[PDB]
Amino acid sequence: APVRSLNCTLRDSQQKSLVMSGPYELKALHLQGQDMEQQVVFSMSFVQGEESNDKIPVALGLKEKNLYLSCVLKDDKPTLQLESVDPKNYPKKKMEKRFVFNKIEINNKLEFESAQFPNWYISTSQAENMPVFLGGTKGGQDITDYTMQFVSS
């Protein structure tokens, strides 16, 4: 397909799942059993960009929703947000830079670095029910690695 994609769910290294907070925000929390279905299913697209054997550029949209994770400057600081796009023009192989993340395979975990803002990663808090955000520090209080689960689509 023009732009190739695959559906998946993500879980941080503390086993927290991701769910929709409001219409433009994601939160991470320890979920299990029935509630497991509240988790967001992503449609990961493999877009164009500087590629490596361990660094792959991708775009993360919500399955069947014209909503994508985006990195923009908000109050002079790199910020993560859910952005609405024209449902007829997306996804596409050449996504605007703000939508691009470098999928990095480390241990057996994954890290998602903003292509727009080098060394800024999709992060979650240790605390329960907090927003998913863009953090500029690795190996610290905040979590920056995940495992990925594939879904039948």
Contact status, residue 150 vs residue 8, Cβ threshold 8 Å: yes
Helix (H) or strand (E) holding 73: strand 67-73
Ordered by where they begin, the domains of the chain are: 1-153 (2.80.10.50)
In this structure, the chain runs to a length of 153
Contact status, residue 72 vs residue 79, Cβ threshold 8 Å: yes
| Long-range contacts (CB closer than 8 Å, 24 or more residues apart) made by 68-76 | 68/99, 69/99, 69/101, 69/122, 70/98, 70/99, 71/98, 71/99, 71/101, 71/114, 71/116, 71/117, 71/120, 71/134, 72/98
Write the CB contacts of 146 (distance below 8 Å, at least 6 apart in sequence). Answer: 10, 11, 12, 13, 109, 110, 111, 112
The DSSP code sequence of 3-61 is S-EEEEEEEETT--EEEE-SSS-EEEE---GGGGGGB--EEEEE-SS---SSEEEEEEE
Return the bridge partners of 72, or none: 79
Query: Nominal resolution in Å?
Result: 2.3
Q: In whole angstroms, how large is the CA radius of gyration of the chain? A: 14
Q: With CA atoms as reference, report the closest residue to 58 among 69, 73, 66.
A: 69
**Residues 49-80: b if buried by 16+ CB within 10 A, e if exposed:** beeeeeebbbbbbbbeeebbbbbeeeeeebbb
Residue 133's identity, in one-letter code, is F
First to last CA, the chain: 15
* 98 SS3 class: helix
Contact status, residue 5 vs residue 37, Cβ threshold 8 Å: no
Residue 153's identity, in one-letter code, is S
Method: X-ray
* 99 SS3 class: helix
Angstrom distance (rounded) from CA 120 to CA 102: 10
3-state DSSP percent of the chain in helix, strand and coil, to 5 = 5, 45, 50
Write the CB contacts of 12 (distance below 8 Å, at least 6 apart in sequence). Answer: 28, 124, 143, 145, 146
Contact status, residue 43 vs residue 62, Cβ threshold 8 Å: yes
Angstrom distance (rounded) from CA 45 to CA 59: 5
Contact status, residue 122 vs residue 69, Cβ threshold 8 Å: yes
